[PDB]
Scaffold this active site. Structure first.
Site, PDB file in Angstrom:
ATOM      1  N   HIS A 130       0.816  -1.207   0.000  1.00  9.59           N
ATOM      2  CA  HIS A 130       0.000   0.000   0.000  1.00  9.59           C
ATOM      3  C   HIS A 130       0.854   1.263   0.000  1.00  9.59           C
ATOM      4  CE1 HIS A 130       0.367  -0.276   4.507  1.00  9.59           C
ATOM      5  NE2 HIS A 130       0.418   1.039   4.383  1.00  9.59           N
TER       6      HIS A 130
ATOM      7  N   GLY B 170       3.080   6.326   9.283  1.00  9.39           N
ATOM      8  CA  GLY B 170       4.429   6.087   8.818  1.00  9.39           C
ATOM      9  C   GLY B 170       5.115   4.878   9.411  1.00  9.39           C
TER      10      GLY B 170
ATOM     11  N   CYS C 182       4.438   1.836   8.997  1.00  8.10           N
ATOM     12  CA  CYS C 182       4.314   0.652   8.162  1.00  8.10           C
ATOM     13  C   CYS C 182       5.678   0.251   7.614  1.00  8.10           C
ATOM     14  CB  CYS C 182       3.324   0.920   7.037  1.00  8.10           C
ATOM     15  SG  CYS C 182       1.617   0.848   7.607  1.00  8.10           S
TER      16      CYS C 182
END
Ligand code: 7W5
Ligand code: 7W5
EC number: 3.4.19.12
Lengths: 306, 306
Positions: free
Chosen positions: B41, B143, B145
């Site tokens: 993503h 952030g 991820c």
């Protein structure tokens, strides 16, 4: 979201862990530039620990009595000196992995991360606080001595702790990196007590703000309190006095949540007076005092390091 | 002595954290050899998150749409492919700091360490477990991820987790490093529930042995129980079934303490049935299920890593 006991990344400190060996004592040391720092009871034997005069013990030693592994490679000691309870072994090689660093002497209540080590090799990393009685509640086995405690400050490894010993209640005592014990302790194997510990009020409150910042609110109340009145209720419950200077550090959190500090005290008050009655805060059934106001802002805001 | 929630040293993983940027999405990636792994993503926008067909979204991208910082230096992407929910960006430089490593897919109940990251930069390290409902209770902000979960096994970094998303109760969902979600979740911004979680019985017991190994004994009892009878009391309290295969892993601890497993179950039994009545175990007022039997042996025995 979320809130965990979180420890500084340990990479930079790991690159400084070396094995230090003298006689049949092997503990860990901190290699920074061309100096390796370890506890000075690496020159002790077992019968030496009951009452040593390390000044004597160390004039009897030579540089070649100090075997220093960094990894598989042996460091050549070329000089040594004793600063308080730390040994400073000047070695011939400077550490290429030496980070920007400092030695700092932290106040009780402040937290730091511990990189636990055996034979120069890190075992784990955890977060601690310096209890009001200058002990720390750690996880330390034999050989763990010379493991250090540290904070990071963007890029700078700020060293505040070296492990020396365990007290009979299973708490731990060590020194700053300039060798001075936190607390009334000595590196003698003679009986010593921790001294009754107190709870770090200002940290409990910050963790309450961590709770609010994360969706736990059940413990709040319409009530307010005066700092003067609140301290009268904290002594009762063995918490530490909260100062106006605490109110100021708790300010940005106070402002970020809309909960004035002196109401978070009125909340804490009732919590001590009633307990939690099954409930938990942030997955803890206890009021948790090992998060500083800066820890909560760190974790709840996302500061990083490099 | 002592017993803390302890996390693997994060050095080796840190040397693998890079920033991965596409469009106006910036998350973290894992650079190992000449491949950088991140969540897929990173090719999504905000309106893309409600229902994307990442196959489509990614054929529309080119290698030059993937900005990869490693430190201050930019990585040149030369190839990409999508394996489940991870992106594998083949870059032109291999990572010199790549450790011996593996990808493993862990079972619920097992623990791992999380290196939390923002813009390629580690923020903190903490220890987690994979809940029975395949969520993890983490600390993750925007952030974060591409932050990974990992174990170490002497020298080998065994990667088991990449962070993808937060669920509405503040728990977290991610994937193994081959891209497959732990649990029924998808990387779509559509409503999903965690599923009611259960307690990791076998881990609670190991932590009870951590307690015995450390001087806390107040919760023991002369009573014994059958595994069959004990599971009948654990369902009641939402614990997970204990298998004979758990009894075997809990064996070495059982033997090290002189407390047969099935008595530590009879102890646990009473604990669920009475609570702790003020007392704490290992400084926790809760039964604590995020320590595996291997964690307790690690911490209570002193295994290290290199
Ligand atoms: C160094 O690696 C080691 C780390 C210990 C080992 C297990 N956990 C630890 O913290 N430190 C030591 O072995 C200490 C050596 C001296 C600093 C030279 C004393 N010894 C101890 O920590 C020691 N503590 C102690 O002797 O003081 C309290 C005491 C209580 C009752 C009676 C006498 C003294 C013990 C680990 C408890 C032996
Ligand atoms: C990636 O850096 C970021 C990390 C998040 C941000 C704060 N904490 C985290 O874990 N992940 C995301 O932003 C996720 C993006 C997708 C994976 C593409 C969805 N989004 C979320 O985690 C997202 N969760 C979610 O949408 O699913 C549960 C849900 C509940 C109710 C209604 C719809 C969906 C939120 C962070 C909750 C927005």
């Amino acid at each position: 979201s979320g809130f965990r006991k979180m420890a500084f990344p340990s990479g930079k400190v790991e690159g400084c862990m070396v094995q230090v060996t003298c006689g049949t004592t092997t503990l860990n040391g901190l290699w920074l530039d061309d100096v390796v720092y370890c506890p000075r009871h690496v020159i002790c034997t077992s019968e030496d620990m009951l009452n040593p005069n390390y000044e004597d013990l160390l004039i009897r030693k030579s540089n070649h009595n100090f075997l220093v592994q960094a990894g598989n490679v042996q460091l050549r000691v070329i000089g040594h000196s004793m600063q308080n309870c730390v040994l400073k072994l000047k070695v011939d090689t400077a550490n290429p992995k030496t980070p920007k660093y400092k030695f700092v002497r932290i106040q009780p209540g402040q937290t730091f991360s511990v990189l636990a080590c055996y034979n120069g090799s890190p075992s784990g990393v955890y977060q601690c606080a310096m209890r009001p009685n200058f002990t720390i509640k750690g996880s330390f086995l034999n050989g763990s001595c010379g493991s250090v405690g540290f904070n990071i400050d963007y890029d700078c490894v700020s060293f505040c702790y070296m492990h020396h010993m365990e007290l009979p209640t299973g708490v731990h005592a060590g020194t700053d990196l300039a060798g001075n014990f936190y607390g009334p302790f000595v590196d003698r194997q003679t009986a010593q007590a921790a001294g009754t510990d107190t709870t770090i009020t200002v940290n409990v409150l910050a963790w309450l703000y961590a709770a609010v910042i994360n969706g736990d609110r059940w413990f709040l109340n319409r009530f307010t309190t005066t700092l003067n009145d609140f301290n009268l209720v904290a002594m009762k419950y063995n918490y530490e006095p909260l100062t106006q200077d605490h109110v100021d550090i708790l300010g940005p959190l106070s402002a970020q949540t809309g909960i004035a500090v002196l109401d978070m005290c009125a909340s804490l008050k009732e919590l001590l007076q009633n307990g939690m009655n099954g409930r938990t805060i942030l997955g803890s059934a206890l009021l948790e005092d090992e998060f500083t106001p800066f820890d909560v802002v760190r974790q709840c805001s996302g500061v990083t390091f490099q």
